[PDB]
Structures are given as C-alpha cells and as structure tokens.
Amino acid sequence: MRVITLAGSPRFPSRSSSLLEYAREKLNGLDVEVYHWNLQNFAPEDLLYARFDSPALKTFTEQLQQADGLIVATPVYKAAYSGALKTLLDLLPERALQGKVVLPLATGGTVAHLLAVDALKPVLSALKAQEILHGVFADDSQVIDYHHRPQFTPNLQTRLDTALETFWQALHR
Amino acid sequence: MRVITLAGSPRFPSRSSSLLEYAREKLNGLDVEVYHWNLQNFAPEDLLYARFDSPALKTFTEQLQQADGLIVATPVYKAAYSGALKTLLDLLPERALQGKVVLPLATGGTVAHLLAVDALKPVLSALKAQEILHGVFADDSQVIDYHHRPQFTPNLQTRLDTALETFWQALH
Numbered sequence: 069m070r071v072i073t074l075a076g077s078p079r080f081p082s083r084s085s086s087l088l089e090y091a092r093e094k095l096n097g098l099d100v101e102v103y104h105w106n107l108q109n110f111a112p113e114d115l116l117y118a119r120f121d122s123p124a125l126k127t128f129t130e131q132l133q134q135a136d137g138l139i140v141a142t143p144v145y146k147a148a149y150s151g152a153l154k155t156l157l158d159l160l161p162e163r164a165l166q167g168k169v170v171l172p173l174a175t176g177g178t179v180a181h182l183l184a185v186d187a188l189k190p191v192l193s194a195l196k197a198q199e200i201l202h203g204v205f206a207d208d209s210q211v212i213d214y215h216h217r218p219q220f221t222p223n224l225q226t227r228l229d230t231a232l233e234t235f236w237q238a239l240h241r
Numbered sequence: 242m243r244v245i246t247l248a249g250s251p252r253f254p255s256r257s258s259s260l261l262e263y264a265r266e267k268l269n270g271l272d273v274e275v276y277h278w279n280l281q282n283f284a285p286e287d288l289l290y291a292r293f294d295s296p297a298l299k300t301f302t303e304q305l306q307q308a309d310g311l312i313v314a315t316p317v318y319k320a321a322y323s324g325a326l327k328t329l330l331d332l333l334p335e336r337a338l339q340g341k342v343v344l345p346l347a348t349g350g351t352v353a354h355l356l357a358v359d360a361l362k363p364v365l366s367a368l369k370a371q372e373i374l375h376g377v378f379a380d381d382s383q384v385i386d387y388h389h390r391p392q393f394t395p396n397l398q399t400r401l402d403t404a405l406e407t408f409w410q411a412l413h
Contacts, residue, residue, distance in 0.1 A: 073387070078289060078290045078291035078292065079291065090290070093289075106292075107289065108340065112285040112286045112288070112289035112290065113285040113286075114323075115285070115287060115289055116251060116280060116283075116285035116288055116325050116326075116328065117251045117252065117280075117281070117325075118251035118252060118325070143333040145327075146327070146330055146331055146333075146363075146364045146367040146368060147363045147364060147366070148363060148364055148367075148368040150327070150328075150331060151288075151324045151325070151326065151327025151328035151329070151330065151331045151333075152289050152290075152291070152324070152328055153324065154318075154319075154321070154324025154327055155251075155289065155323075155324035155325050155328060156324070157319055157324065158251075158318040158319055158323060158324050158325075160319075180367075190319075190320045190321060191319045191320060191321055194320035194321075194353075195319060206386040237339070
C-alpha cells in the first residue's frame with residue numbers, strides 16, 4: 069500500500085510538516101510506501117494562476133492516483149483550511165480521491181481554530197473521498213520544536229497514534 | 242463612499258472580473274470611488290508563502306482600510322471559494338472587514354456550484370464584516386462576454402443590478 073502525505077502550510081518547516089513526518093515514520097514502520105509532499109514542492113505561480121501544465125502538479129497527480137490514502141495537514145486561517153492548500157486541491161481532477169481514505173489534520177492556537185478542525189470535509193467530499201476520518205486538531209502548544217524531530221505533548225501523541233491506527237485499518241476496508 | 246472590488250479567479254480576464262467591471266460601471270455612475278484588484282496584481286510567492294512585507298499587500302490593505310464596502314467575486318472550485326482568493330484573505334489583518342459591507346459573488350457551471358454561493362461567509366465573518374449580503378451566483382452560461390466589456394444575459398444583468406442596488410443601499 070501507498071499513502072500520500074501533504075503539508076498545506078505556507079512555510080516549511082511547520083507544525084503540519086512535523087505531524088506528517090511522524091505519520092510517514094509510523095506508516096513506513098507498517099511497510100507502507102509514503103509519497104511525501106508539501107506546498108514548497110510546487111511553483112507558487114502555477115498554484116495561484118491554475119497552470120495545469122505544472123510538472124509538479126502532474127507528478128503529484130500521478131502519485132495520488134496510485135495511492136490508497138491521503139493524510140493532509142493544514143494550519144487554520146480565517147476559520148478554514150489554508151488558501152495555500154486549497155490552491156493545490158482546486159487543480160486536482162474532479163474525482164481525485166475516489167476510493168481513497170483521507171485523514172485530515174489541522175493546527176492552530178485558539179478555540180476558534182479548533183472549531184475549524186473539519187473545515188476540509190466539504191472539499192474532500194467534493195473530491196469523492198471514500199472515507200473521511202474525524203479531523204485531528206493539534207493546538208500550537210502541543211507541537212514542540214517543529215523545526216526538528218516530531219515531538220508532541222502526550223495528549224496529542226495519543227490522539228495522533230489513535231487516528232493513524234484507524235487510518236491504517238481503514239486502508240484495509 | 243469608497244468600495245474595493247476584488248477578483249478571486251486564478252485567471253484574468255475571468256467571469257469574476259467581468260462581474261466586477263459591470264459593478265464598477267454602475268458605481269462610477271453613482272460617484273462611488275472604486276479601487277479594483279485582482280490576484281494578478283500580487284506576487285504569487287508572497288501569497289503562497291505568506292510574505293507580509295508584500296508591497297502590493299500593503300497597498301491593498303491600506304485601500305481596504307479606507308473602504309466602506311467590498312465586492313468580492315470568486316469561481317467555485319471543489320464546493321467552495323477559490324484557494325487563490327483565500328491565500329490573499331488569509332494575509333489580511335484580524336478584523337480587516339470591521340465596519341464594512343460585503344457583497345459576495347460566485348461563478349460556476351452547475352447546481353453543485355450554486356450550493357457554494359455562501360461559502361465565503363465563515364471567512365468574511367472571521368474578518369468581522371459588519372454586513373454580509375446574500376451571495377449572488379452567476380452561471381457561466383449567462384456570461385456572454387468576459388474578455389471585452391462585460392455582456393450578460395438579461396436575467397443575469399437584472400439580478401446583478403438588483404444586488405448592486407441592495408449593496409449601495411446598505412452602504413447608505
């Protein structure tokens with residue numbers, strides 16, 4: 069099995085990239101091949117101006133088509149997912165997530181941000197995801213020194229491990 | 242009175258920009274000052290990588306600060322507003338629409354697209370807009386020309402004029 073990870077932060081490193089490095093490690097340990105992407109793998113002018121001839125878009129799309137699941141992480145901005153992430157999602161084929169399991173992750177610093185934990189759901193449903201797991205919310209305080217190795221407070225670590233085990237099981241269903 | 246218009250399409254010209262050009266013609270006639278922006282006015286690197294020193298961002302935010310209202314138009318992609326528009330909205334200050342009236346416009350080709358006519362509402366609410374008008378949907382099939390001067394079907398023209406009159410009344 070094959071999983072795409074996608075960080076949707078405007079910056080790298082980010083809290084999103086820390087969550088997804090952990091996810092990649094856990095999935096690799098389960099013998100899952102991981103295709104690891106972030107927004108800095110794309111040219112901004114191709115994302116902002118919807119250039120379907122983008123080589124990174126075509127490469128990502130080829131790899132996504134082969135993947136059984138997607139783990140996607142975004143900071144919460146203005147009560148929703150990041151526009152930066154959405155620029156890439158908007159350029160995917162219309163049924164790009166058909167037959168795939170999706171685990172959404174969100175990061176932010178306030179209760180208002182926590183209310184946006186499932187803001188990607190309509191977008192992922194529009195992309196025809198087969199199964200959309202409950203979104204995991206990582207408060208900014210729970211991701212420790214995201215510039216270096218993945219490091220989480222125990223509350224977040226437990227929730228992330230739980231979600232990743234649910235995701236792994238869903239890949240088999 | 243001052244109004245900002247903001248086209249949220251990845252391409253220019255677009256159906257969105259044509260709606261806003263129509264609005265600009267009307268507001269010109271009503272002696273409302275209009276500052277018109279599109280996403281091609283920004284450096285894409287600044288929007289995608291959230292670079293707040295962006296000069297165009299500074300000018301846009303200063304013009305928005307002095308504006309009484311905002312007309313914002315987006316194509317509908319994946320059941321929501323465009324990500325390209327949202328990249329710019331994400332860089333605005335926390336209460337950037339405080340005290341302002343907003344008219345949201347959306348374009349698309351199917352009824353699924355129509356269902357996202359109010360998709361911007363949570364974002365505009367997060368920006369503390371004083372009054373968010375009901376969203377107006379323009380079907381692609383009723384935009385006859387968006388490259389030259391805007392040309393719309395009579396029904397779309399009537400509906401846009403009605404919404405723009407509502408917007409003008411709200412400003413006053």
